[PDB]
Amino acid sequence: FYEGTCVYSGYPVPRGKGTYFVSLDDKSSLFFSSKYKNFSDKKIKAKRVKQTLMSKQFCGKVESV
Amino acid sequence: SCRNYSAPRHGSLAYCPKKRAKTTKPAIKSFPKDDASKPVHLTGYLAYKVGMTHVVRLSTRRSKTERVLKETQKEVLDAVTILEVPAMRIFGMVGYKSTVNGLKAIKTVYAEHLDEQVLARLRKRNSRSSKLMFKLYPQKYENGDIKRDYELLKRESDVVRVLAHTQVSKIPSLNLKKAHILEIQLNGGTIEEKIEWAIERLEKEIPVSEVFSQQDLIDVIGVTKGKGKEGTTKRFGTTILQHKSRKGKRKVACIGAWHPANVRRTVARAGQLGFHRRTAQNKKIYMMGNGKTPFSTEYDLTSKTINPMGGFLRYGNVKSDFIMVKGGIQGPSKRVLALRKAFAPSNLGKDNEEIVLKFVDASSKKGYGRFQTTEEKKAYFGI
Amino acid sequence: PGKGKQPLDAIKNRYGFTRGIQVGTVLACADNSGAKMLKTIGVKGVSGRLNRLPAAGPGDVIVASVVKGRSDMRKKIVLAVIIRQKQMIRRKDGVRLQFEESAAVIISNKGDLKGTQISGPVLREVCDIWPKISSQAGSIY
RNA sequence: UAGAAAGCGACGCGGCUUUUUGAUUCUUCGAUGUCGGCUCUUCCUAGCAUGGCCAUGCAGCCGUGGCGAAGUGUUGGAUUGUUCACCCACUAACAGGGAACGUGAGCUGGGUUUAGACCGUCGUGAGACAGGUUAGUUUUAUCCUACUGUCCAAACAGUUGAAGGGAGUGUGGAUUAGUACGAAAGGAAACCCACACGUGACCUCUGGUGCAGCGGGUGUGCGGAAGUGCAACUGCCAUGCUACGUCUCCUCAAGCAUAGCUGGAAGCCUCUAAGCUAGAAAUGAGUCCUGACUCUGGAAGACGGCCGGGAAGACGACCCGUAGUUAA
RNA sequence: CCUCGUCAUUUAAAUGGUGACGCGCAUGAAUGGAAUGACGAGAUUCCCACUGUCCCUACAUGUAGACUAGCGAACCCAUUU
RNA sequence: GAGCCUCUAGUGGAUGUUUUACACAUGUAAGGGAAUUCGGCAAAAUGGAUGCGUAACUUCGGGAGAAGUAUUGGUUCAAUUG
RNA sequence: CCUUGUUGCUGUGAAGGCUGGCGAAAGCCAGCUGGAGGCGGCAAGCCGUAUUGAUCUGCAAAUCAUUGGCGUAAGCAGGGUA
């Protein structure tokens, strides 16, 4: 069982962990931890954070769609 | 003059004086009422605290008067504690007699062969002994002293209890070579039946499945975590004083009036906190199982043991039988606890409901645990 | 129970969430009635203990005064329902939520809404105990 | 609305209290720190809410007058140095008091009441004014006793229970039900579920903290790079600790006020004179914490130090290990 | 003095602040009277920003403190508590 | 000739123990933001240089850095003080 | 009263002067030069507002920390003399 997939990191989230953040734009979004939520606020682009699943796919280190 | 505004007291006087417990192992001091109408059964056991995890269960509990047509079912997430319970071994019995001064012990009778683990409790320092402990007692079997002893117990007794020890050698993480010994009461039938039932079982092993089953309510007796000497702010919960005060803010400001000219026992003072005996009533058994047989739910079709990835932090892996119970339990990992059948049955609706599990969490307790098995980790990373 | 000025006739069950909004808090108004900012002066249902400030969560009814809005409406006392909150909440299923900004919506003594449209997202649990809010909210979470 | 007495009760008369202010000067002038607030505990009842009842000008809803009862509650603010007062908001309700006008080697120092200075009124003046205004040093426990924990009196293993402590309180929703009751308008009465305050524990989750660990930059040192000092800044974060997190909290017995049963005095009557029944958040026990004097058992050796650890810790004490799933 | 004077404005709420009014216990003209600028570690009221002052406290650092070696006092004292 | 870092020249002892509570010097904090208190006391916030833009009143000198806003590192070039 | 010692870095930009424009005149407007003041921000220094902080058997019969006021001048100081 999973809670979902983290918006910023790309990481799958275990049941009973993480949090949803809801913006006034009306969108609901899931984050793995406080670490990656804060990186969003500070406008760090995910592709530069080299341990993320997003970054690894973009570089072609991991096979993706 | 009367104080300006009303407020409640700080802390409960039901637990004063709050002194330190004498030793770490508790005796069950009170047992539920006997009933001659039922078969002979045991009333308690010993267990070791492993650690905590969480589960998801299905529920359908709602007000009987709620007008909603549909049989609504809902997921609930709950925290649980795991206890390890290897089989205890029976090694003797005691009879008691009722007097104007309460119960008094008449005689104690021991098995012919006793184990190294139990003899080790009788000496103080383990590695320095001549081991001439019980070596002359076996003659009493030849002499018929045992047969005279049983006669006296059977003739003159009101209450009968067995002596049992735990097999510490099965739990290596304890670093312990002396067994723990507990006296457990027998309820049901007559004195004669109780004595015969006991005699049949000296030297043998009783599994936990004799005493308890799933969904049962039980009482847990233990000693809490220790916290050393502490001030009034933490020991009794009193408020911190004004920020600009000299001579300290973390204290009770006024400790009495002029008369009486002494301090009352009801005022808060600094001292020992933690390491006290406490009993938790009516906790419910969610599951019973074994540390090395995998299990599954109707919904989670993975097959896994209770052990999380990397084990419980300062314990490792469960190997013997285990019980799982709702909520938190006294003391740190590795402490001994006493389990008892509930003293009286509960009327509350939250207690008497069924339990149906759909998921149990097995992720790592060190750091953020993000996989349920080694197969998932090997699949997420390469190769 | 209905006592004093501005009594409430339509009592409902509380949920036990954390209480992010307390006396002194200024918060936005989400409806189209013409108020813009509300200043919290009291909470319904609070019996109080020494030294503690009264506090509320989603679903609770607050007493407030109108500190920004149209001229006819300012410096008057009004009732409102809390629809979202910036402090974190835990559902009984174990899910946790957090919104970007807190807000409330104005009601009558009988529990009827003052306006006709509500800006932005609203918490699901509120729509379970205040059914009229479901009709005119932006999105439900 | 009839009518002394549901509720009131003129004109008069008898008491109790020490929480108001007087009256008096018995104790202290080789010194008993003086108003209010903050903090914290206990007691009283002349009962505001919460429980059981009786009367009614008690239909129902809301009330009003009385009885046994002190277990649990009695809040957040604006002006003011205030106690007091007066308003706003909530509430089941926001009763009234005592303990050297409780509480300064517990704090604070706004008021009053030393020495500087302004104003008004009084005085020829020096100066006065329970008239107004502004600035104005808060010392010392290391003694005895109390109180809170700690060891010894009490070899080791298993227990017993004398006596002392004590804990759960309240609100709402649904259902009975738009029912009984009332011309109508209005409008009640268990069980179950949600919550708040209080109590005792616990870290699986979520916040917080950053001692161990990994990274980044600014100024200047070790010839450069690499490894790095000093001034200090900064992103993440194990274990642990913690609440803004999670779990927790009823059952008997004897009986108050009352309302009843049988029943004489007193052939009738009658709750009482003997005897019996129902009876309160109150009382006494159990479940819960502390643990006096005891009781049962093993064996010619036992136990303490020294050495090494912690789940325990101010120091003692407690839990453990020493040729082994021992340590490195 | 009466007095927390009356009316307006500032607040949810004003023994406060500012604006008006005046038979002013007992204002007032070098015992100096009245209206401003620039400048006060001078007295007073309000708004914006900001925050452990507070709700309601939690965790961590250095130095003392506890225990130990060497050195080593005083206040006070009818004392049986 | 500020603070911070280095060259010349000069410098140091009541012993061991990881060490509770309460202190004294300091750090950080979810949501709220003076509700605290006689009183924002203490703390936080603002901060240098360059440019844009600056009110009432005034003895016409001032107010005035009013207020309010934007920019700022390394590298490689043009142009010569912009 | 007599004889002496002690002013470093920066901001603002008075009087006087030179160019260019406008004007019939008188004298108005720009840009630059010049460097006044018991004038602003600081350093060395001199002082003593707050924390009613530390200390109160003190380091000290008036000291220490942070925070403050002035600092091109009715400023601070040695010796001789009254």
Side-chain angles (χ1 to χ4, degrees):
Chain A
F1 298 100
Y2 287 122
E3 192 56 47
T5 305
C6 176
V7 162
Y8 183 95
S9 323
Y11 289 167
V13 188
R15 181 84 259 263
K17 289 163 186 184
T19 62
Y20 297 84
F21 186 82
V22 186
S23 73
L24 300 174
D25 195 48
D26 64 358
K27 299 181 174 186
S28 185
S29 59
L30 177 70
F31 293 104
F32 183 82
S33 71
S34 293
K35 182 174 184 181
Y36 299 108
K37 195 272 175 182
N38 292 347
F39 290 169
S40 305
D41 293 354
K42 288 200 167 184
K43 296 181 179 182
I44 295 155
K45 285 190 178 178
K47 64 183 181 187
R48 297 277 75 208
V49 182
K50 285 197 171 184
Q51 84 281 355
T52 61
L53 194 55
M54 296 306 296
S55 177
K56 267 196 158 60
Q57 292 183 15
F58 174 90
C59 299
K61 303 275 191 177
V62 163
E63 292 194 331
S64 187
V65 294
Chain B
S1 299
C2 57
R3 67 173 282 193
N4 292 65
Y5 305 89
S6 184
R9 226 204 96 86
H10 292 277
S12 178
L13 286 180
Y15 296 111
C16 293
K18 40 182 74 184
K19 59 213 309 164
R20 199 189 286 159
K22 255 75 192 283
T23 58
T24 189
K25 166 256 165 177
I28 310 171
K29 276 182 155 191
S30 56
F31 289 102
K33 271 188 80 181
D34 192 13
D35 178 3
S37 322
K38 298 171 171 176
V40 179
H41 64 276
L42 280 166
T43 55
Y45 220 74
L46 284 183
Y48 294 91
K49 187 175 160 172
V50 189
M52 285 201 90
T53 192
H54 74 263
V55 303
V56 169
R57 49 186 261 262
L58 291 168
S59 67
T60 197
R61 186 180 157 244
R62 50 163 267 286
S63 325
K64 65 151 74 64
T65 54
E66 271 174 67
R67 206 175 55 87
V68 64
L69 176 63
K70 194 191 175 184
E71 285 180 330
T72 56
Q73 197 166 53
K74 296 163 184 178
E75 291 180 321
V76 173
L77 192 141
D78 276 312
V80 295
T81 300
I82 305 299
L83 306 176
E84 193 155 23
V85 276
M88 295 186 80
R89 170 167 259 117
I90 292 174
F91 76 95
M93 65 197 295
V94 179
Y96 289 86
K97 186 171 190 170
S98 293
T99 74
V100 292
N101 298 301
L103 289 179
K104 299 294 161 186
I106 299 302
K107 214 167 193 288
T108 181
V109 179
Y110 299 101
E112 191 182 354
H113 305 274
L114 303 169
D115 194 25
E116 282 186 49
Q117 293 175 104
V118 66
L119 292 172
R121 251 295 152 209
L122 307 182
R123 63 178 176 265
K124 202 51 168 188
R125 193 151 150 174
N126 178 50
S127 307
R128 180 179 74 161
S129 187
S130 52
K131 277 108 196 297
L132 23 105
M133 243 296 123
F134 251 92
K135 288 205 164 179
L136 295 163
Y137 173 89
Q139 288 174 7
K140 294 177 86 71
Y141 280 86
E142 311 304 344
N143 306 150
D145 272 19
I146 265 65
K147 293 173 85 180
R148 269 171 282 109
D149 281 357
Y150 291 146
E151 188 270 312
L152 173 66
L153 250 65
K154 205 172 305 187
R155 198 206 314 140
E156 300 193 47
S157 181
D158 298 285
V159 165
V160 175
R161 303 189 176 161
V162 286
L163 293 181
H165 79 260
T166 190
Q167 299 183 64
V168 286
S169 55
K170 283 172 163 63
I171 317 172
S173 186
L174 293 178
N175 193 33
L176 185 60
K177 292 189 193 187
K178 305 168 173 169
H180 291 263
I181 296 163
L182 181 72
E183 176 181 301
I184 309 170
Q185 178 161 316
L186 289 176
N187 281 357
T190 60
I191 295 281
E192 182 168 36
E193 290 165 281
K194 288 178 180 175
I195 291 165
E196 284 181 327
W197 188 100
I199 285 174
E200 287 161 19
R201 287 172 178 76
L202 259 66
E203 293 189 36
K204 292 183 182 173
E205 282 175 58
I206 309 298
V208 65
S209 62
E210 177 65 20
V211 186
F212 303 116
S213 67
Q214 200 183 118
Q215 276 85 30
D216 291 336
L217 295 175
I218 67 157
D219 303 340
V220 183
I221 302 163
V223 177
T224 62
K225 276 196 175 178
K227 278 166 188 183
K229 188 195 180 182
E230 197 52 65
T232 76
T233 303
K234 182 159 165 185
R235 195 182 191 221
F236 288 93
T238 57
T239 60
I240 303 184
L241 296 171
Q242 189 194 21
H243 74 290
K244 58 198 276 170
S245 51
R246 197 196 166 208
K247 304 172 179 184
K249 322 188 196 158
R250 293 179 73 90
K251 63 183 262 171
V252 175
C254 174
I255 61 156
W258 194 319
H259 286 273
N262 289 108
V263 180
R264 289 193 215 248
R265 62 99 190 186
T266 57
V267 175
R269 320 276 272 145
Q272 172 75 33
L273 179 57
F275 207 78
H276 315 294
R277 177 186 173 106
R278 288 289 183 265
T279 176
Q281 296 293 102
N282 294 325
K283 288 193 168 280
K284 197 163 180 85
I285 300 179
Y286 269 36
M287 172 177 280
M288 293 189 75
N290 181 282
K292 59 173 65 182
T293 64
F295 65 93
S296 301
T297 81
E298 310 176 312
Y299 316 92
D300 173 16
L301 298 183
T302 69
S303 192
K304 54 165 173 282
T305 64
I306 192 68
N307 295 301
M309 287 184 53
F312 298 90
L313 276 189
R314 272 159 264 106
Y315 197 103
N317 298 311
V318 178
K319 290 181 168 81
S320 203
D321 295 337
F322 73 89
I323 286 164
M324 180 167 90
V325 281
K326 160 84 168 299
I329 272 179
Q330 300 92 296
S333 190
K334 294 187 281 190
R335 215 196 274 331
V336 60
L337 300 167
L339 274 58
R340 189 179 72 186
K341 282 203 180 201
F343 195 84
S346 172
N347 295 312
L348 301 178
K350 69 167 184 71
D351 295 348
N352 294 299
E353 193 48 62
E354 291 296 333
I355 305 150
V356 184
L357 276 80
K358 61 175 289 181
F359 172 75
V360 176
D361 180 26
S363 56
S364 173
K365 268 57 188 161
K366 182 154 71 181
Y368 194 111
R370 56 195 278 214
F371 310 104
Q372 260 81 30
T373 61
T374 48
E375 291 170 40
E376 296 154 46
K377 186 173 169 193
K378 274 194 176 73
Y380 174 83
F381 297 106
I383 306 157
Chain C
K3 283 184 84 181
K5 316 161 186 75
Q6 69 265 344
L8 173 69
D9 298 344
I11 308 299
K12 311 285 195 282
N13 275 29
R14 288 202 75 249
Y15 298 100
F17 308 134
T18 314
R19 290 139 71 205
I21 289 142
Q22 65 179 200
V23 172
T25 306
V26 174
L27 64 140
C29 192
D31 67 55
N32 59 341
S33 63
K36 297 174 177 186
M37 287 287 167
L38 297 176
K39 187 178 61 194
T40 306
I41 75 170
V43 184
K44 293 296 196 184
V46 175
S47 196
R49 71 149 285 153
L50 190 78
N51 296 333
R52 187 167 303 186
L53 298 174
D60 293 326
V61 181
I62 58 155
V63 194
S65 66
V66 178
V67 294
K68 280 180 193 287
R70 57 187 301 267
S71 185
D72 296 349
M73 213 161 195
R74 286 204 304 272
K75 314 191 183 175
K76 293 172 172 170
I77 286 161
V78 67
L79 311 174
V81 173
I82 296 166
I83 53 157
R84 57 181 182 258
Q85 194 194 60
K86 202 169 183 291
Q87 174 65 294
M88 194 153 272
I89 68 153
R90 194 189 101 113
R91 280 179 165 156
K92 275 200 172 287
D93 186 37
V95 174
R96 282 169 154 110
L97 292 164
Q98 176 162 54
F99 296 83
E100 181 177 341
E101 282 206 299
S102 63
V105 155
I106 291 172
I107 58 162
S108 175
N109 296 359
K110 302 301 182 184
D112 305 319
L113 307 185
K114 182 68 180 181
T116 56
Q117 193 175 350
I118 297 168
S119 316
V122 170
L123 184 66
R124 176 72 55 180
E125 279 82 359
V126 179
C127 303
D128 298 342
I129 54 162
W130 297 94
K132 300 298 173 177
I133 292 181
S134 179
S135 305
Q136 66 190 51
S139 188
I140 320 294
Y141 295 112

